[PDB]
């Protein structure tokens, strides 16, 4: 079986390249971040523009939802993160401590902590309520491309241009594991699987890999797309068929069968690199976002 993703909506509004798109856990909203220094909120089902959230002084590389869909955290070249109350648009906290661009961010499952990665080669853990930095991990020897908490928040995974994925104990800050395969390309993205058993890692040699991080073993390789330059997000699609989803530098969205690793669909329509994709939590809906020559977000829907 293969999906039948078809283009339903194209979302115009950002004035520069879009950097990240994320569906709210409650399925109601899509959040987008951009090099235009703005966050935009859109209806998840109709793509209807809701509002603009502003305040960063420079471009934004990432945005992430709290698990109750009430807050966003954003990571900016202005070297801050900002915590936003989505309903009011208010900047609750500005998180200051990184010494270079902030590239990536996430809440933990119980949304009392934020994790961030930076061009300063550190991973930082922040208290959501106080907005204060709790820990600085000297994590990598090159910019940190992605950070993610596991299912219970006890672990953080980080990836870096240094070629490593590292697993950190949230409580102690101890490095518990370093993962690398037989070559050492920059690692451009990582996240834990929905069941928390695997990490999905992108490297800038046109490759996605599914790792059992506790065994330290590469279980699956996904290839066929183009990824040698940009930090492109990748997703687990779990609402219908079990897919891997990624953007690509050939301006397509790629969809793989997770088990078989075969390409099952390519989505055409963007006019520039697809930097970010997101999968809706309950409906078979993909959001995709593209770089400076395109500036749009597309919503795609499948029967399976």
């Amino acid at each position: 079986v293969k999906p039948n993703y078809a283009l339903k909506f194209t979302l115009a509004g950002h004035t520069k390249a879009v950097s990240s798109v994320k569906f709210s856990p409650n399925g109601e909203w899509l959040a987008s971040s951009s090099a235009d220094k703005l966050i935009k909120i859109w209806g998840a089902y109709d793509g209807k523009f809701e509002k603009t959230i502003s305040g960063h002084k420079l471009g934004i590389s990432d945005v992430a939802w709290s698990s109750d869909s009430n807050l966003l955290v954003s990571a900016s070249d202005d070297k801050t993160l900002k915590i936003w109350d989505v309903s009011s648009g208010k900047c609750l906290k500005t998180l200051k401590g990184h010494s270079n661009y902030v590239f990536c961010c996430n809440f933990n499952p119980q949304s009392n902590l934020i994790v961030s990665g930076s061009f300063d080669e550190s991973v930082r853990i922040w208290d959501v309520k106080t907005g204060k930095c709790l820990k600085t991990l000297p994590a990598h020897s090159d910019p940190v491309s992605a950070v993610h908490f596991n299912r219970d928040g006890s672990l953080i995974v980080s990836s870096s241009y240094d070629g490593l994925c590292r697993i950190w104990d949230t409580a102690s800050g101890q490095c518990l594991k370093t993962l690398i395969d037989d070559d050492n390309p920059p690692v451009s993205f990582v996240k834990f699987s929905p069941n928390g058993k695997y990490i999905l890692a992108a490297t800038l040699d046109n490759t996605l890999k599914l790792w059992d991080y506790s065994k330290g073993k590469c279980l699956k390789t996904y290839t066929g797309h183009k990824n040698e330059k940009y930090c492109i997000f990748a997703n687990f699609s779990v609402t219908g068929g079990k897919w891997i989803v990624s953007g690509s530098e050939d301006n397509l969205v790629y969809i793989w069968n997770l088990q078989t690793k075969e390409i099952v669909q390519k989505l055409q329509g963007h006019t520039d690199v697809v930097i970010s994709t997101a999968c809706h939590p309950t409906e078979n809906i993909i959001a995709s976002a593209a770089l400076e020559n395109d500036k749009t977000i597309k919503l795609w829907k499948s029967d399976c």
Binding site: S19, S61, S76, Y101, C231, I275
Partner: peptide, 7 residues
Amino acid sequence: ARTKETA
């Protein structure tokens, strides 16, 4: 930002 950032 991510939108032009390379290694």
